[PDB]
């Protein structure tokens, strides 16, 4: 919506923060087995549901 409330905007803020790629400085960490982020949500494919 064009106008929303503070709670919904704060909830969307964390999704915006989380929708970020994997940093390239942890790939060389000892014991690291993460190759790519499996929680990347697309605005068109997967709807977060309010």
């Amino acid at each position: 919506s064009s106008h929303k409330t503070f709670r919904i905007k704060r909830f969307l803020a964390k999704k915006q923060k989380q929708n970020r790629p994997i940093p390239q400085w942890i790939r060389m960490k000892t014991g690291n087995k993460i190759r790519y982020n499996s929680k990347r949500r697309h605005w068109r494919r997967t709807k977060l549901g309010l």
Partner: protein
Amino acid sequence: TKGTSSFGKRRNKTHTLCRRCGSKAYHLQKSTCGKCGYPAKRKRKYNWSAKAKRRNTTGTGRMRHLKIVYRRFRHGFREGTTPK
């Protein structure tokens, strides 16, 4: 027209984020939650579903206060001060 053409009319919402559980079970029209019943002082748990308690019982969260009680019980709930 009961299918695809009728699905396009879905515009409103009947559930938002709850206040006690944070899930999307809170009903706007009935003003009650579908997972806990926020107006009710007691949280609604049921033995019919075993998986409901698995996602809601203690230990499945942070336990910011319950983490330290198990640690302080091993010493008998001391209140003094370490020597020196």
